[PDB]
């Protein structure tokens, strides 16, 4: 029996420096976790102990911190090369800076194969991108060979910027001919490494014949066999055993997100490449594991430029950006308008004749805005100034909500109005009118929303049974500030871009900003 050790990471999201237990900025260094240097230590420890090791990434290394903002993918290429990853799969966030923002920094600098079988190219790009990403790759692991086939979320055109020259095919439909090609090459050990989510991983395991193990991402799924070592709640056992349509027991694995855990799976194979046994658990990268001094040296060397960028002028403001709690938690504030205008602009994705844009609405809780910005300091706006406004290192996510759920959210926004409570919503592409004399839960008297399936955008009343796409902070999607109706009634939720980054990009683009209080929220 030939034993294989699969080491895997997914949805790292620029968390190169060590983080807190909640994956935010490190405060107490003695109880800090994750980091690319700590991972290097654990990977090197395993490699010394096990003879057959494979380090795999299931996408979403891109987007997360100031590292991605400044180095734009070069940090991912450099540190993944240093950790000696065996193969990577393309995720949605790898297309965040367009197709050119993937080809140049990552695809051309990475010293390992980057995979995806369900991405097809057309137009002038087809010849330029051909061969830069492979559908599969046969990896020699000592005396044996292991085939790795890749896949990317079919939803990337709505979550990132791949452009009009890339087509995202159905995973099971595109994977099977590539799995069959590995079978003709007499490869009896096949891993499906991709970025489409846990539900899709289970489908590939059940329907794609020939696949022996599925290593996924996207959904930040945490699987654990036994007692969890931290705050993460297991979604199932590690591995998650799927019974395929051909009869085989197929293990499915995921290693949460933000580089907190290193996935660890031990597969036993027979001479014919059939799974005898599969066992393991994600290793918690905690304080007990020391940071490698060589990698930490590079981290600190690169961190200098990041500190220089945070004090640099991104753009100017000719208006006082009113982010005071007395304004933003009581009425329409121009800071709330600016962030929501930034949120919509960031989610402008290549649309067909069906809509001007797939998403037009934005909601942001007042308690999310933590500081104003003064325009009298030459008009200057720096990353540091924006960090005071949005300090919790959250993201701006895309959700699908029924009209009724959104009406319930606006009713929650003013249920205990006049107490400076945080649930008060700031908007974008929404027109609300409240009557505070009315009973709580029946205070929204007008709620108009900007259309999507229209060539000329205009405001129309919100329909209670119709599903609407909204950009809102991660905190709200997770039921924060009492928005339980958001968490319990959302139809779809997707991991977005970093909060500070979204607003920094918008200000840089605009050069000079002048947001006004234009009457998006009205009273009586």
């Amino acid at each position, epitope marked *: 029996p030939w034993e294989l050790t699969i080491l895997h990471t997914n949805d790292v999201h620029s968390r190169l420096e060590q983080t807190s237990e909640d994956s935010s900025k490190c405060v107490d260094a003695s109880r800090c976790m994750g980091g690319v240097a700590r991972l290097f230590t654990k990977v090197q420890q395993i490699r010394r102990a096990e003879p057959n090791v494979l380090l795999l990434d299931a996408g979403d290394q891109y987007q997360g911190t100031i590292w991605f903002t400044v180095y734009k993918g070069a940090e991912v290429a450099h540190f993944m090369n240093a950790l000696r990853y065996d193969a990577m799969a393309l995720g949605n966030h790898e297309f965040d800076n367009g197709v050119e923002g993937l080809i140049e920094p990552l695809l051309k600098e990475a010293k390992f194969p980057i995979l995806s079988a369900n991405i097809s190219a057309s137009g002038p790009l087809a*010849s330029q991108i051909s*061969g830069l990403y492979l559908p599969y790759k046969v990896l020699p692991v000592g005396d044996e060979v292991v085939g790795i086939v890749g896949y990317t979320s079919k939803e990337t055109p709505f979550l990132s910027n791949p452009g009009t020259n890339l087509v995202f095919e159905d995973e099971i439909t595109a994977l099977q001919p590539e799995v069959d090609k590995l079978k003709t090459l007499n490869v009896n050990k096949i891993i499906a490494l991709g970025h489409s989510g846990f539900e899709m991983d289970k489908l590939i395991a059940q329907k794609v014949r020939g696949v022996d193990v599925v290593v996924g991402g996207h959904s930040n799924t945490f699987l654990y066999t036994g007692n969890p070592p931290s705050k993460e709640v297991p979604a199932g056992k590690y591995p998650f055993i799927v019974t395929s349509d051909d009869g085989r027991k197929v293990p499915v694995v995921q290693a949460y997100a933000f580089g907190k855990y290193l996935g660890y799976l031990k597969i036993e194979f027979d001479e014919r490449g059939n799974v005898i046994s599969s066992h393991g658990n994600p290793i918690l990268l905690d304080s007990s594991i020391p940071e490698d001094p060589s990698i930490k040296a590079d981290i600190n060397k690169w961190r200098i430029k990041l500190d220089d960028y945070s004090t640099q002028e991104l753009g100017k403001t000719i208006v006082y950006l009113d982010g005071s709690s007395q304004s933003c938690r009581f009425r329409e504030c121009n800071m709330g308008n600016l962030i929501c205008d930034a949120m919509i602009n960031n989610n402008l994705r290549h649309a067909d004749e069906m809509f001007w844009n797939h998403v037009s609405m934005c909601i942001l809780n007042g308690g999310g805005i933590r500081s104003p910005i003064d325009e009298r300091n030459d008009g200057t706006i720096t990353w540091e100034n924006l960090a005071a406004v949005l300090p919790f290192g959250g993201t701006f996510d895309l959700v699908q909500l029924k009209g009724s759920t959104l009406k319930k959210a606006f009713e929650h926004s003013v249920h205990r109005y006049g107490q400076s409570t945080g649930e008060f919503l700031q908007v974008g592409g929404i027109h609300v009118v409240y009557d505070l004399s009315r009973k709580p839960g029946d205070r929204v008297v007008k709620l108009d929303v900007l259309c999507t399936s229209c060539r000329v955008p205009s405001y129309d009343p919100l329909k209670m049974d119709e599903v609407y796409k909204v950009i809102l902070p991660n905190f709200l999607a997770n039921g924060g500030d009492g928005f339980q109706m958001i968490k319990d009634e959302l139809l779809r939720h997707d991991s977005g871009d970093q909060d500070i980054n979204v607003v920094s990009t918008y200000i840089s683009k605009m050069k000079v900003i002048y947001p006004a209080v234009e009457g998006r929220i009205k009273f009586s």
Partner: antibody
Amino acid sequence: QVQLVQSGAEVKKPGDSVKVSCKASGYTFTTYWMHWVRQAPGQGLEWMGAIYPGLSDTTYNQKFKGKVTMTRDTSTSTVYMKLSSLRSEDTAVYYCARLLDYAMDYWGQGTLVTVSS
Amino acid sequence: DIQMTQSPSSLSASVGDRVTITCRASQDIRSYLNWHQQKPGKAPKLLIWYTSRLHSGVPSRFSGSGSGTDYTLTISSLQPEDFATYFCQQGETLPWTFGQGTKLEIKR
């Protein structure tokens, strides 16, 4: 390191049979494919067939079916290629190549087969 | 049987010049295009695999592009060791077929 050593140049008469060897070194012999390509003067490169030693699975080009037979010996890590009923048209430089997935990365020095009466 | 039409059949150039060799297939060979370099009386060495990916030890000056049926090999600044015969090959469907070749002669 990665090296493929082929048998010496051979001279055969029409109707004879020639057996060309290809010894492998520096890699796991059983997990790789062994291909055979011929180069005739002023005719270009022509693909003949392939063998997966770790299973003895063979695949030949329809033109060479019943004319070519590929064998292996996992002991000495040698691949043999046999050519029955030789003709003047079979006068070419025969190469053995290593393949993992996409391409034939390493080739052998070549074996010249001269067929004349 | 996929036919591989490689042009030019012969090319005369000097050290430092840009070299462009094109290869065209009768059918869409789905990016399975491999480039090989063969010196006289020697084994052909692999240059580029799957349209653009360089083989181990191949210098940065060599680059491959293309998609569907039309593919292209490029040598940015030609060197004295780069004067040899160049062959393209399709690995999409069997039997695998090679191009006629391109002889690279030193201009004097």
